[PDB]
Amino acid sequence: QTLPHGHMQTLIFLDLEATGLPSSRPEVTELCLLAVHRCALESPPPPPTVPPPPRVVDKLSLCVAPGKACSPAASEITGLSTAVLAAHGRQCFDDNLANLLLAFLRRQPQPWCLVAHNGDRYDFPLLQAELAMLGLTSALDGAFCVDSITALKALERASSPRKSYSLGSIYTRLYGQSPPDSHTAEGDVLALLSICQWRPQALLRWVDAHARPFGTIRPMYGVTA
Amino acid sequence: QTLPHGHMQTLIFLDLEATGLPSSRPEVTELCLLAVHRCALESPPPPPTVPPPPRVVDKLSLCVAPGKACSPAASEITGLSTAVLAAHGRQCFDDNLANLLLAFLRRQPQPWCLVAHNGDRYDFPLLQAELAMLGLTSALDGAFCVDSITALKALERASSPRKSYSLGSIYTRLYGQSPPDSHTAEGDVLALLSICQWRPQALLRWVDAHARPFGTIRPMYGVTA
């Protein structure tokens, strides 16, 4: 099927930062969602330069207090530590946060498609795990999702030694400069948006064909329901 | 009283963009909230350069479909028009949006203080008016608010022909460069944050003394309750 779930109407670019690797039972420290209606990517289009983001976007960036320490590597990479987060009064991943995320999604036309780089192995199962610990094991079931590593592999294969498909590797290969020297969830989402604007119509075709119901993502840890 | 309502814990920088001037019964087209815990401004500190934003911030930026046309001047300034907003599937100012705003505020330690440039004459009464049309005439009553025009007038008077206190005028006077060439609610909030970081401890003293309960803001139009 070219449209198993119809055309995705809104792409919600997502990044989660957390306390450590999956084997550590990590907890979210920061999240960013950037919602872009598909029409911002419905465009007919020398080495390219970074495109500007669409004018009409919705953005949500939040810091979150985990119930455990960040690993030294995580704090090095993200600039967040549990003491830093506590000094700023950050709250845990709770029911109010889940309601905020859903209310943000409800501002967007459906179908919704979350887009995250390495989402299938990290961001999506982690988000499912945090919701599972709250017993909100179906809260995001209305959403679809795709992993942009898989997408960009497909787009680059159709477009043309093995390449890396890390976010930074793709961005620098496409645009000849490194993504803005930022270490935030928002920075990662903005860089992902830029890579998704490289071949935007081809991206939308791939997304429509591969969109996966979020309820089929198994949680990284915690209960399934 | 130096602390009529205690120390404000979180400053939520706010900008609203809308369809026209107050005399036109305007409706919101875009909003941005940027929440910064006060500790990011509790710092002892040649011509200065623009300071970087704090690492730990929460951000929400949303576009909104008004129930009427934008004025030509408004669309010129903001890049938004009702057709553009409709093409991106934007939703009106509704109950879900009000709930989203409140859930965002509930991520922040209280007391909350909204900070908006010209807020007393524009952003605060307009936000009250939109909530009033939904019958949510006390939804934000827990918040306090201050107008940064009044604040910066006070700070510059203590620090040193008449000056303009428009956002751009203050920013260029303090930092010797114009605020990033952006025409978005988020851009205005980021520029306001930068000006509030000029004399941050003095700003916090002024804010604590002048914080005003949001429920005392009369709506620009609509019912009072």
Author numbering:
A (entry chain A), B (entry chain A): 4 to 48, 53 to 167, 173 to 237
Extract from the study:
TREX1 is a cytosolic DNA nuclease essential for regulation of cGAS-STING immune signaling. Human TREX1 is a 3′-to-5′ exonuclease composed of an N-terminal DNase catalytic domain (amino acids 1–242) and an unstructured C-terminus (amino acids 243–314) implicated in membrane targeting. Loss of TREX1 function results in accumulation of cytosolic DNA, inappropriate activation of cGAS-STING signaling, and severe autoimmunity. The overall structure of hTREX1 adopts the homodimeric conformation previously defined for mTREX1 with enzymatic active sites on opposite outer faces of the dimer.
Reasoning that reduced thermal stability and poor crystal packing may explain the lack of structural information for hTREX1, we screened each hTREX1 chimera for the ability for form protein crystals. We identified conditions for the growth of hTREX1 Chi 2, Chi 3.1, Chi 4.1, and Chi 5.1 crystals and determined three crystal structures (hTREX1 Chi 3.1, Chi 4.1, and Chi 5.1). A 1.25 Å structure of human TREX1 establishes a complete model of solvation of the exonuclease active site and a 2.2 Å structure of the human TREX1–DNA complex enables identification of specific substitutions involved in DNA recognition. Solvation of an enzyme active site is a critical parameter for protein-small molecule interactions. Notably, the high-resolution of the hTREX1 Chi 4.1 structure reveals the human catalytic active site in exceptional detail, including 18 well-defined waters in the core of the enzymatic pocket providing a template for structure-guided drug discovery. High-resolution structures of hTREX1 and hyper-crystallizable hTREX1 variants now provide key insight and tools to facilitate the development of TREX1 therapeutics.
